[PDB]
Ligand SMILES: *[C@@H]1O[C@H](CO)[C@@H](O)[C@H](O[C@H]2O[C@H](CO)[C@H](O)[C@H](O)[C@H]2O)[C@H]1NC(C)=O
């Protein structure tokens with residue numbers, strides 16, 4: 469009459485799952501900031517356009533000509549995507565999202581490579597003047613381990 | 627779409643089972659030498675009788691008047707129970723039995739407390755003369771951790 473054998477199969481499948489569990493914990497989180505990155509890249513046409521037609525970065529959602537509140541640029545895991553002086557910043561929600569990335573953010577910004585702009589992707593940045601952004605890391609930025617290698621740009625990237 | 631939650635329940639039930647598994651491993655083994663002890667205590671009436679009617683310990687199964695081969699005193703986990711000079715020794719099988727106790731043994735022997743005998747239970751012993759046994763530990767004796775506290779007698783017990 470065999471509990472033991474069953475207790476061995478439960479035991480080996482349950483440590484395998486505990487072993488897997490971190491990897492899938494980190495897989496999901498990368499798929500959840502993947503959307504934030506996509507919601508923010510949607511906004512680059514408008515920003516690029518706005519800067520090209522005028523010489524000035526759009527001050528907000530409404531200048532660039534995208535939905536006036538950021539909360540309307542929201543997804544399954546992103547709460548809001550926001551243009552603030554040509555820098556678009558996506559904030560993760562705090563529901564349906566992994567704890568180490570809930571409520572955190574990344575940013576896309578561009579530099580003029582005179583004739584067009586050059587875009588970058590990375591952790592939050594604030595525009596200081598028409599060609600320089602500065603790190604805006606306040607402790608709510610997506611950790612580097614969850615950012616793709618494409619979106620690892622530092623404030624001074626060129 | 628939730629693998630994670632399931633992976634957490636599998637993970638917690640599987641470490642609990644790995645935690646339990648030693649205890650139940652040791653539970654079973656105590657229930658398996660429990661039978662060896664019972665198969666050997668069955669044989670004490672005959673041995674006690676034989677010594678009382680004569681002054682000599684029975685030399686074998688056939689003198690004491692129990693089944694001439696020990697292999698016929700066998701159970702679910704015991705292979706054979708054997709009278710050899712008044713000492714009855716039970717050997718565990720090597721199938722249906724836990725590895726740390728498979729093939730190992732214990733022994734019951736008595737001393738004359740003149741008028742009757744006094745019995746003891748413990749790890750194997752060999753009779754040296756009509757009143758002394760000696761430890762017969764050859765490396766095939768049941769470990770102390772699996773012997774009940776009732777069956778912890780040392781060779782020189784009185
Ligand atoms: C759109 O982005 C421009 C970047 O250079 C801003 O000037 C612009 O603000 C100006 O236009 C609005 C129009 O209502 C207001 O008059 C502001 O006071 C102006 O500075 C900005 N538009 C918005 C709605 O902020």
Ligand SMILES: *[C@@H]1O[C@H](CO)[C@@H](O)[C@H](O[C@H]2O[C@H](CO)[C@H](O)[C@H](O)[C@H]2O)[C@H]1NC(C)=O
Nearest residue numbers: 676680682683684685686687688689690711
């Ligand atoms: C039964 O136990 C006795 C203990 O004192 C032994 O002597 C006895 O052996 C003797 O009797 C048998 C009978 O067949 C043989 O004759 C032996 O040679 C005797 O020593 C023992 N009986 C057995 C079967 O060993």
Ligand SMILES: [Pt+2]
Nearest residue numbers: 518521522531
């Ligand atoms: Pt304009």
Ligand SMILES: [Pt+2]
Nearest residue numbers: 676679680689
């Ligand atoms: Pt006799």
